């Protein structure tokens, strides 16, 4: 016994507050968004909308997503990328109609794939600006062979699924660009995380559904690993 009466009151109040905060916190999902300057990550952000780092929130089917965009920083990022070791997905947005800065995009993807603190995190890949790619290939004033000559040996796979109305040439181009990233993804053979590709444009409204489905699959694989079933 003593005169110390706050020694129970303050502890109990603070414990109650932290319990409520824990129950609020553990039901949210957190995503990190990366891209380059000419990528259209800002337009995507503005579309599913409804200094330091920018922050957005959205809700799908009564599940809350919390997404982080890196803002006014310097060019070198090898030191603060370690503060993101507990997120579920990295959303990587890459341009598709430039042909020049594409190699730097692949190299950055390779760098973020093999980092030591990010060997248990998966990547969702968005390829932006597709209609520009279609128009540019149909114009035919520039040949992809000047930057990837191996395209001269590429043919459409037999299991192609093109939407009706598309020339096979644009389909071939799209699938080659996808194939480069997928090969760099599977090169390690680590078998602990996966890459999910998609095609997207400047005006589309189904991006939240895609993120939801992919996150659901990621959680399921985590649970299968955890319970000695796989």
């Amino acid at each position: 016994s003593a005169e110390d009466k706050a020694a129970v009151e303050r502890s109990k109040m603070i414990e109650k507050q932290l319990q409520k905060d824990k129950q609020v916190y553990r039901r949210t999902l957190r995503l990190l968004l990366l891209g380059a300057d000419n990528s259209g990550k800002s337009t995507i952000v503005k579309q599913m909308r409804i200094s330091g780092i920018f922050e957005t929130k959205f809700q799908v089917d009564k599940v809350n997503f919390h997404m982080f965009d890196v803002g006014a920083q310097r060019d070198e990022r090898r030191k603060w990328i370690q503060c993101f070791n507990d997120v579920t997905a990295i959303i990587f947005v890459v341009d598709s109609s430039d042909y020049n800065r594409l190699q730097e995009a692949l190299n950055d993807f390779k760098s973020i794939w093999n980092n030591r603190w990010l060997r248990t995190i998966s990547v969702i890949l968005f390829l932006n600006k597709q209609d520009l790619l279609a128009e540019k290939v149909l114009a035919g004033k520039s040949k992809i062979e000047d930057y990837f000559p191996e395209f001269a040996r590429y043919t459409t796979p037999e299991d192609a699924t093109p939407e009706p109305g598309e020339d096979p040439r644009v389909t071939r181009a799209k699938y080659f660009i996808r194939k480069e990233f997928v090969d760099i993804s599977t090169a390690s053979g680590d078998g602990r995380h996966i890459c999910y590709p998609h095609f997207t444009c400047s005006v589309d409204t189904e991006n939240a559904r895609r993120i939801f489905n992919d996150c659901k699959d990621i959680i399921l694989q985590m649970n299968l690993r955890e319970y000695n079933l796989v």
Binding site: K22, K79, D86
Partner: protein, 338 residues
């Protein structure tokens, strides 16, 4: 013409190298190898504190050796009393990424900062009993990595834009700005007499700074990679540095050269925090191998090992009266050793 200036710089560097090699008359492993070895030092956990939901990024002891502050990526500050494991304060943050803490020498204020490019200064003694933000300092262009106090009127700050600064609380304006580094500044420490301070900035380099002047006094080189932690020897004329090449080193301030290099062949990991003890004999360090080591300063050998954490050791500290040592790691638990 850019040729004459580089030639002069090379000549000055050669002169400095000759001056440093002239004073290198012996190695201190020769005049410190006939002392009584400290022995075997083993420690055990006396208490364990729970309540954080995520990783602990930093902590600090007060001036009474009783009260402490800690903070996590939850957006939470917690102020503990370690005599009885009971909580006294909890404060929520306006941002969820915070990377440094502090504790005022008078027990009235605390300070914080993170990726939000801003410092936040909180008052603790109010008539209403509700902790509400007092001041907010902006003006940097990069993540803020450390902040300490001199009195209740000045705060020294270090950021990732290769610069350091001194701030005056009342006006809210910078009073002096320190430039001269080339990379990310990470670690900062204040002199015990509150007259000078020391910084290290991811170029394998370290520098000494005067507060009232605003210019470098001396620059030390010798590591191979980034520098992550820094601390003063108790007496005020030495500092010991830790880097990402698996090495600790000791420097003085009057000889401008390396004295002891502490390392081992079986270590290929990094150093996350470093601190000293009161007499000056025990040097504690936390590693990425999920443990901590205790070393002796004048001998360049090992004394003991502390284990018990399931992830990286991120923050470490030793009290002002020498009674206990506190540690915090990415598993969301703080521990106290004596």
């Amino acid at each position: 013409e850019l040729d004459q200036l580089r030639q002069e710089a090379e000549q000055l560097k050669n002169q400095i190298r000759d001056a440093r090699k002239a004073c290198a008359d012996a190695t201190l492993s020769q005049i410190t190898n006939n002392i009584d070895p400290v022995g075997r030092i083993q420690m055990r956990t006396r208490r364990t504190l729970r309540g954080h939901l995520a990783k602990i990024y930093a902590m600090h002891w007060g001036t009474d050796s009783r009260l402490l502050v800690s903070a996590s990526q939850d957006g939470k500050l917690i102020i503990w009393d370690s005599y009885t494991t009971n909580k006294v304060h909890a404060i929520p943050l306006r941002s969820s990424w915070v990377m440094t803490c502090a504790y005022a020498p008078s027990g009235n204020y605390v300070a914080c900062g993170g990726l939000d490019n801003i410092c936040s200064i909180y008052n603790l003694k109010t008539r209403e009993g509700n902790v509400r933000v007092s001041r907010e300092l902006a003006g940097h262009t990069g993540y803020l990595s450390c902040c300490r106090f001199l009195d209740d009127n000045q705060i020294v700050t270090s950021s990732g834009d290769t610069t350091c600064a001194l701030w005056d609380i009342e006006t809210g304006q910078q009073t002096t700005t320190f430039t001269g580094h080339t990379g990310d500044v990470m670690s900062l420490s204040l002199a015990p007499d509150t007259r000078l301070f020391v910084s290290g900035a991811c170029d394998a380099s370290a520098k000494l700074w005067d507060v009232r002047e605003g210019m470098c006094r001396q620059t030390f080189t010798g590591h191979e990679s980034d520098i992550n932690a820094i601390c003063f020897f108790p007496n005020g004329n030495a500092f010991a540095t830790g880097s990402d090449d698996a090495t600790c080193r000791l420097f003085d301030l009057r000889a401008d050269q390396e004295l002891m290099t502490y390392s081992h062949d079986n270590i290929i990991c990094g150093i996350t925090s470093v601190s000293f003890s009161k007499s000056g004999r025990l040097l504690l360090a936390g590693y990425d191998d999920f443990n901590c080591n205790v070393w002796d300063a004048l001998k360049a050998d090992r004394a003991g090992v502390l284990a018990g954490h399931d992830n990286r050791v991120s923050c470490l500290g030793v009290t002002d009266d020498g009674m206990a040592v506190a540690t915090g790691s990415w598993d969301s638990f703080l521990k106290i050793w004596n």
